[PDB]
Structure formats: C-alpha cells, structure tokens
C-alpha cells in the first residue's frame, strides 16, 4: 500500500476509535448521574399505577 493509504487509513481508525472511547466515557457518566438522580429514562423502577385507584363515591364519606 501507499504511505498515503496507511496514513489516512490510520487517521480514520483513530477518529473512529477515539469517538467510541469518548462515547464510552459519556456512557459511564450518564449511568452514574441517572442512578444517582433517577431523572433519566434508565433505572426507572416501577411504582403503583394510579389508574388502579377507584375514584367513585365510596360507602363512607371520610376518605
């Protein structure tokens, strides 16, 4: 191969691998913040659905 080919192919490899490495570091930091705060789409453990609540007028008033 030409040294141009190896050289620019190496630059392509280094761009792809450095972008993957920065995305992995961002993935670690995103997971840390979402586990700490719970305000992301991940780590959303379920609570009780409020579509189960009966809002009908019950038998006794004080409720």
């Amino acid at each position: 191969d030409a040294p141009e080919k190896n050289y620019e192919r190496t630059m392509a490899i280094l761009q792809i691998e450095s972008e993957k490495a920065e995305l992995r570091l961002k993935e670690l930091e995103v997971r840390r913040l979402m586990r700490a705060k719970g305000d992301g789409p991940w780590f959303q453990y379920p609570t009780i659905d409020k579509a189960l609540i009966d809002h009908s007028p019950k038998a006794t008033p004080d409720n």
Binding site: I16, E19, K20, L23, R24, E27, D39, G40, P41, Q44
Partner: protein, 57 residues
C-alpha cells in the same frame, strides 16, 4: 297527605342544588412531582455499533 314512597324510590340517586362552592382540593394534596421527560425524536442508529471493547457492530 304524605304518600309512602314505593319500592325503589328512596334508593334513587337524586340531584341537589347548592349555593356553596365545590371544594377544589378536599384531599389537601400538595403540588404533584414533575414527571420524567419522555423520549422524542427519530431513532438514529448506534454510533459505531455496540462499542463493546472491539466489536465494531
């Protein structure tokens, strides 16, 4: 002149005209927590795949 109600009448659900306001918060509920933001936008493919150590896809 009082007619005794027939079988079925005293168990009806009636309507009542009131002059008091409707209780706007009878449970005294405070402000609800703001929900988590949903996802919006189209689904682009994964940037350079799985990124699992050396697997390029």
């Amino acid at each position: 002149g009082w007619v005794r109600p027939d079988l079925g009448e005293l168990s009806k659900v009636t309507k009542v005209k009131t002059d008091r306001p409707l209780p706007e918060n009878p449970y005294h509920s405070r402000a609800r927590p703001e929900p988590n933001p949903e996802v919006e936008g189209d689904l682009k493919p994964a940037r350079h795949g799985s990124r699992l150590f050396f697997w390029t896809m």
